[PDB]
């Protein structure tokens with residue numbers, strides 16, 4: 001009864017327009033209703049996650065830090081708290097979906113006439129568990145203490161994840177927004193995502209323990225560049241220093257001799273395991289939503305497909321519709 | 326070959342460690358027959374920079390002195406409490422990978438506390454006592470990973486007046502009284518889950534109110550019972566208005582969450598061990614239980630590996 005689907009997670013910085021451009025893609029291809037399934041960001045839960053408003057809280061906390069209404073040491077812990085709120089929703093979902101995914105190691109008895117059903121999603125779990133938390137650290141708004149809980153506890157990623165990092169020119173990104181507009185965080189966020197990509201590619205060939213002992217620890221000088229120049233350049237064959245491991249080499253995770261502590265190592269392993277499965281793609285949103293979406297279309301043929309029960313797709317759809325409700 | 330995964334939990338200060346060790350010294354006559362994994366204090370006391378333990382307690386002291394808003398003190402707590410998760414999880418997740426899921430004296434690998442202690446028992450106790458905001462429950466309860474078959478949860482128990490001497494960190498009835506209660510519920514929940522679905526008498530479960538919380542901090546009510554009912558479980562504590570909508574229905578995602586939370590707890594094989602006596606007895610009793618526990622299968626090779634890893638981090 002099988003049929004191949006196309007899991008596509010659309011990520012990148014915020015305010016860039018990856019949503020009004022992800023929707024304009026649904027209108028001009030969903031000519032046939034059952035050929036595409038969209039899953040939007042769960043604001044409804046973020047803005048009322050068991051009582052607190054993750055969004056307001058993550059920003060308000062910074063405003064509260066500047067006014068000195070709270071200790072900078074607490075403001076960091078306080079941040080970690082809110083930042084973490086974004087995790088659950090996206091995770092409950094992703095975890096369910098991985099369950100409806102057919103991981104059949106076998107030959108095909110029959111083929112399906114129809115084209116592959118593409119299920120588009122707004123942001124991938126790593127955004128909450130790795131991209132943002134890491135950007136907060138780099139900018140100094142959050143304490144590293146919360147990285148293990150998010151980076152090292154990642155669940156096995158099922159084959160076929162297509163991560164599409166959206167990108168916009170810098171001066172244009174600063175208009176799509178004007179929540180708070182401060183270069184430091186943005187400049188970093190953009191950078192991090194670029195690293196993410198380099199990390200995925202990197203991980204495709206080499207192990208995380210590559211030039212680890214050749215990776216200078218993460219210092220304030222490094223963080224400074226990340227908040228100013230948007231350095232980190234996306235490159236053909238990435239090296240350890242063009243990845244996220246450049247940001248993970250932290251004294252707080254290593255011991256006396258300067259070795260990354262045992263557990264934390266095992267963690268790097270799973271974090272690698274996850275990112276490595278992914279199929280990285282970059283999509284420019286520097287133009288009319290029409291183009292952005294058209295471009296995304298040209299990529300469909302390059303993405304890695306996965307298999308799932310025809311029945312399940314119909315179920316998934318209902319669930320997705322049951323919660324985006 | 327077949328191993329015996331045994332996780333030893335319960336309240337703190339009770340002595341489940343000096344009694345879990347006295348069990349290793351007596352039956353490890355043959356070296357390769359038993360493997361112990363102790364609590365990773367070394368990481369808790371320096372988890373990427375902060376000392377989870379001091380922070381969870383100090384935050385309370387800081388709350389009483391009014392050095393910080395009670396609203397922040399709650400969020401601040403959630404933060405630290407969460408720190409306890411990673412270590413235990415990195416481990417457990419690795420171990421699940423070395424477990425053979427393929428369709429004479431078995432090697433028993435004893436562990437100090439099971440991940441649910443950090444992700445469900447303690448966080449929940451903090452809530453009930455009012456030291457933590459519910460906002461952090463979904464992140465810990467609903468994101469639980471598939472538990473592999475063969476988990477033997479052994480909840481240790483001590484008499485009340487005796488428990489208050491094993492400790493005297495901070496000694497305050499409210500939290501203890503609750504912690505004891507919660508663990509009892511956990512057990513009742515596991516059993517309960519064996520037969521019925523979480524959506525049983527859900528619509529007959531009164532929401533969680535302050536009156537309820539009050540009893541949980543005073544009488545150690547919650548009694549362990551043969552055939553548990555919805556109200557003797559943890560679901561009695563999970564029915565929260567903050568998780569339900571207007572009409573009073575538990576919101577979609579949170580439901581799916583309950584599902585996975587149930588999925589986990591249900592796999593477990595619950596056992597109660599009394600530490601109200603000489604460590605010798607405590608351990609001897611635990612031995613009598615070995616034959617009742619559910620065994621799992623793993624590569625002989627893996628066991629040797631696991632051992633090395635365990636030894637590699639328990640140094």
Ligand SMILES: Nc1ncnc2c1ncn2[C@@H]1O[C@H](COP(=O)(O)OP(=O)(O)O)[C@@H](O)[C@H]1O
Nearest residue numbers: 336337338339340341342343344491602603604
């Ligand atoms: N069965 C017992 N009888 C008397 N004292 C005990 C017993 N078990 C433990 N203790 C004492 O109480 C203290 C706390 O117990 P511990 O083993 O550390 O508990 P836990 O496993 O909860 O951390 C120990 O340092 C020990 O001296």
Ligand SMILES: O=c1[nH]c(=O)n([C@H]2C[C@H](O)[C@@H](COP(=O)(O)O)O2)cc1/C=C/Br
Nearest residue numbers: 014015041058086090123125127128132
């Ligand atoms: O981890 C996060 N942290 C965060 O602060 N945010 C923030 C970023 C932004 O203000 C808002 C989400 O809106 P858009 O990203 O669609 O513009 O929440 C988002 C995530 C990620 C969720 Br997965």
Ligand SMILES: O=c1[nH]c(=O)n([C@H]2C[C@H](O)[C@@H](COP(=O)(O)O)O2)cc1/C=C/Br
Nearest residue numbers: 337338364381409413438440442443447
């Ligand atoms: O989640 C937790 N939260 C917590 O505060 N603690 C606390 C409880 C205790 O002070 C200390 C651990 O010592 P024992 O439990 O062995 O006596 O950390 C522990 C856990 C659980 C880890 Br899994």
